[PDB]
């Protein structure tokens with residue numbers, strides 16, 4: 001059939017590949033197109049800090065916690081392969097700092113080497129008085145997208161620069177199944193007021209001497225609203241602002257002063273570090289991920305649509321669970337239609 | 340006081356700065372000079388991986404364990420300064436890998452978060468069964484000598500590019516005190532059967548994705564001679580164990596392959612690492628450090644010599660304790676006048 005995938009971020013390409021891997025052979029070719037108005041380096045995925053860490057509390061949906069662990073073990077299976085780093089993948093250890101005792105997270109056993117910080121370690125951080133150490137994985141969004149873009153291309157999947165104006169335009173274009181991987185902009189094709197823009201701004205620096213990640217938490221302020229330092233492959237990511245409901249795509253001086261001063265308080269060696277750039281992106285924030293099937297009809301046309309959007313703060317930490325799951329839903333469509 | 344420090348590696352320059360910090364005030368006539376046939380970047384100190392880790396089993400001199408511990412506390416007390424990475428200093432986390440269970444080292448509680456590797460960690464390393472995880476410090480030899488040089492220079496200490504043929508000749512130059520930090524070449528000025536060269540070839544690569552050191556210890560053998568991978572401030576250092584007794588400064592194809600093949604199998608992502616250099620150094624291997632005082636009469640020419648050499652593959656790890664010790668013994672020269 002004719003599958004169209006709208007969106008070239010981590011969700012869009014994890015999904016296009018996951019589907020194509022399973023539902024393709026040499027005498028059952030599955031025609032996949034990828035329509036998208038933004039490709040790497042210009043997606044929200046290229047901004048993502050890179051790191052694998054879910055939210056501290058165990059999530060409401062029991063499927064989301066599976067999607068996290070399935071994602072972790074999928075990436076961890078590549079650690080030791082010659083091409084881990086070429087996917088944007090490498091191991092990284094680090095600190096999570098709190099201003100007060102909190103329960104161990106639900107993923108203490110998912111990560112490698114979890115443990116509490118000793119008193120000696122906590123004096124390294126004057127402003128904080130409790131926390132953890134653990135080993136995890138960098139998945140550099142910019143790289144992973146380059147790699148996924150190439151695996152798709154080897155397999156014959158084709159890409160088109162195209163702003164989809166409605167699901168119908170793509171339906172009349174002659175598309176049997178559509179995968180809706182438009183992230184924060186999903187609300188334009190079909191309204192969805194539960195989906196807000198999580199506006200985060202980051203500073204990227206050269207500070208290759210920084211090797212561990214350092215993630216502070218403010219529980220009052222919620223996730224990403226407190227300084228984090230994340231070592232990348234070529235550069236350190238500096239962050240600490242996340243504004244839910246702000247659609248301003250401009251970088252601004254208020255966020256710079258917050259990220260810069262907060263991060264220099266943790267890591268004073270950053271006074272020298274050259275700023276390479278500053279970027280803003282929109283987490284597709286949503287109380288839950290919309291990952292479901294929905295048939296549509298129009299005047300001269302009708303179609304099958306699968307949603308994969310609203311991952312918010314955890315696109316890379318969950319993309320593969322979400323993709324495996326879309327490919328099953330897609331399997332159901334081919335089962336029901338005698339293909 | 341006329342002091343001559345022979346040597347411009349870590350030992351000589353740390354020892355010159357201790358001495359000066361602790362005595363420029365009290366002794367108003369204090370003139371220190373640094374003689375060396377090599378300065379940075381040509382010292383064995385510069386070749387080193389720059390990593391705080393003592394030897395696995397315990398030392399012979401128990402003084403050595405306290406000099407190590409003193410060094411760690413000193414460097415750690417700069418973690419928090421804005422000028423730690425300009426000093427050559429930054430934390431690093433990493434893995435020690437073994438082919439059998441071994442007792443925990445005497446330094447487990449000096450380093451941060453010392454701990455055994457779990458099974459999924461050990462699954463990441465197919466040819467290894469046991470190990471430790473801990474967070475230590477990188478002290479980049481090259482960058483630290485630079486810091487040390489600028490410090491000593493504001494302080495007025497004078498440097499001279501110059502080869503010493505004997506202790507005798509420095510002493511007739513008016514040298515009251517001679518601090519002997521000549522590393523592996525110390526035998527030239529006074530025979531020492533115990534001092535051999537730990538020759539170690541290394542490969543510097545451009546591989547900034549690697550955030551953790553990985554050290555192997557193949558205590559018998561298994562072709563690869565314990566490959567290690569140590570991330571630096573910019574480049575990574577690949578290497579093996581020392582070949583003791585070898586004085587050959589030339590790089591050889593035999594050792595390149597051992598190191599490259601052996602480390603590539605430790606960390607396969609090394610396949611696309613740009614090689615930036617390949618250098619050979621000589622550790623001052625000796626069953627225990629020689630940190631002691633000795634006097635020399637060459638007629639009615641009087642001189643105090645304080646030896647601070649023989650630090651093995653651990654001189655960056657132990658430097659500051661020794662430098663401090665040599666400060667004390669220098670006081671007990673001043674004391675006797």
Ligand SMILES: Cc1cc2nc3c(=O)[nH]c(=O)nc-3n(C[C@H](O)[C@H](O)[C@H](O)COP(=O)(O)OP(=O)(O)OC[C@H]3O[C@@H](n4cnc5c(N)ncnc54)[C@H](O)[C@@H]3O)c2cc1C
Pocket residue numbers: 006007008009010011012035036037038039043044045046047048049050051052162163164165181182183184185186188189198199200201202239280281282283284308309310311312313314315316317318
């Ligand atoms: C500062 C910051 C740091 C973050 N750090 C991390 C992190 O460390 N770890 C983590 O797991 N997650 C992190 N995230 C979250 C992560 O960025 C997102 O969850 C993820 O990138 C969203 O993936 P996506 O593919 O749904 O959307 P996107 O990456 O934005 O991709 C959307 C694609 O759909 C296309 N599109 C949209 N509408 C249309 C249309 N009408 N027609 C055609 N194409 C369309 C776009 O052009 C684009 O190609 C972070 C977010 C921010 C802001």
Ligand SMILES: Cc1cc2nc3c(=O)[nH]c(=O)nc-3n(C[C@H](O)[C@H](O)[C@H](O)COP(=O)(O)OP(=O)(O)OC[C@H]3O[C@@H](n4cnc5c(N)ncnc54)[C@H](O)[C@@H]3O)c2cc1C
Pocket residue numbers: 345346347348349350351374375376377378382383384385386387388389390391392501502503504520521522523524525527528537538539540541578620621622623648649650651652653654655656657
């Ligand atoms: C491959 C390698 C890796 C290593 N890795 C580590 C590590 O990760 N961590 C660690 O702690 N240690 C490490 N070391 C050990 C460390 O390099 C040595 O212990 C340390 O450099 C010894 O310092 P030094 O000042 O005694 O020697 P050097 O740096 O060799 O300094 C010797 C000085 O004496 C001078 N000199 C000698 N004779 C004369 C003379 N007659 N006249 C004038 N000048 C003279 C030389 O020119 C030089 O200035 C490593 C060594 C090697 C070879």
